[PDB]
Every structure is written in structure tokens, then in C-alpha cells.
Amino acid sequence: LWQYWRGLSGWNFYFLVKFGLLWAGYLNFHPLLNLVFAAFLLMPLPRYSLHRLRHWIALPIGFALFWHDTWLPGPESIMSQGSQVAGFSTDYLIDLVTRFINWQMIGAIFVLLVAWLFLSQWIRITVFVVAILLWLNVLTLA
């Protein structure tokens, strides 16, 4: 089964971003759910097809989980209030978007991406991600 354990690949970056956001105070982090998700991603699958399937399944799940961890209104609230947003002029929407998007945060995420690309070659980032996840869970239980 040793040969079938494949590190969190691109999902390492997903978690790093989450950690960064948690640290910045933008995320309500649910430690156990994220650990379960990580466990799901680390689970040893022998077949290449199962790996593809996992990636496909993991993408929506990861997104959902990320959203859940965010302070963002549920898709239901957006759908019910979305009809009010459709009446906003394009200029207002752009203004809202520019105010909402912190270009500094985007830049940080980018820097993190480059760092991750660079570090993933030297160090097993998965080990750290899992360690931090374990640690965060322990903190929530203590």
C-alpha cells in the first residue's frame, strides 16, 4: 500500500491558503471537517481511475467546505436576494467588487502560491499541512 500513498498534491495549496486566511481572521475554521477532508484525500487508492474520481469529487467538496468555513451567505440567501442585485448598474457592481476585493490579499495568495511551488520541491508540504491540522484540532479540544 506504500506505493499508493500520494501526497495532497495541489490540495496542499488549498490548505495553506486556508491557514493564511484563518490567521488573518477571515475564516471560521472547522478543524474536524477539514481533517476528514484531508483524510479523504490521503486515503490510498491503487487504481489511477479512482484517483481521477477522487479529484473530481474533491473539487466540489473542497469548494463547499471552503465556503462553509467562510462568513459568506448561504447559496439560498444569494438566490433569494439575488433578484435584488440584478437591478444594480454595472458601475455599482464594479465598485462593489473593487471594494470587496483586497488586492493585498490576492497578492499574498499569489506569493504563497509561488512559495508553495518552490518549497514543494524541497520539502514535503503534506507533512506540515497534516501536522497543523492535527494541531488545530487538538487546540479546539483543549
Partner: protein, 96 residues
């Protein structure tokens, strides 16, 4: 560290690999203490460093050239520090 303890704690393939290596270190004149520590560090290196990656393969292949002062077959307790220092040197003032 043929110690009844490793036989009880580690699975047979892992134990066999560790023992093989340990013995290899002893054959090349490393003290028991140094050999154990060497095995420990190796394990640590495997855990944190993707030794399967083409980069680490190249570095391992050129180990004798890059780290002439460090004998891979005779580990010394301060070998990690020596690796760090040399690596820092290679990273900085080492261009020719």
C-alpha cells in the same frame, strides 16, 4: 540497536531495512551511537524531504562532489550541522 525493541515496534520490512543500514554503517567503522543517530536522521529526512524527487536524486548522486567532507557511510552526530553549513555555503558564495 538490534534491540528486541525495534523488532517489537516496527513492521518486518521496515525493520529489515533499518537493520541493513545500521549494519552497513557499523561495517564502515561508525560508532553504535553515531550509527543509530544516522538512521534516525535518515528517517527524518525521508519524512520531510521527498527523496524520490529528481532534485534530491541529483544531489544524492553528486553527494560526493557537493559534500566532500561528509562521509555518507560513516555518519557523525554533527553531520546535520555540517550539511547545513555547507548547504548555506553552496547557496551563497559558491559560483564557478
Amino acid at each position: 540497536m538490534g534491540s528486541i525493541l525495534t523488532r517489537w515496534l516496527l513492521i518486518p520490512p521496515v525493520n529489515a531495512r533499518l537493520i541493513g543500514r545500521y549494519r552497513d554503517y557499523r561495517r564502515h567503522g561508525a560508532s553504535a551511537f553515531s550509527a543509530t543517530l544516522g538512521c534516525f536522521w535518515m528517517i527524518l529526512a525521508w519524512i520531510f524531504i521527498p527523496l524520490e524527487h529528481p532534485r534530491w536524486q541529483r544531489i544524492r548522486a553528486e553527494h560526493k562532489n557537493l559534500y566532500p567532507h561528509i562521509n555518507a557511510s560513516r555518519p557523525r552526530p554533527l553531520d546535520p550541522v555540517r550539511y547545513l553549513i555547507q548547504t548555506c555555503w553552496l547557496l551563497i558564495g559558491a559560483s564557478r
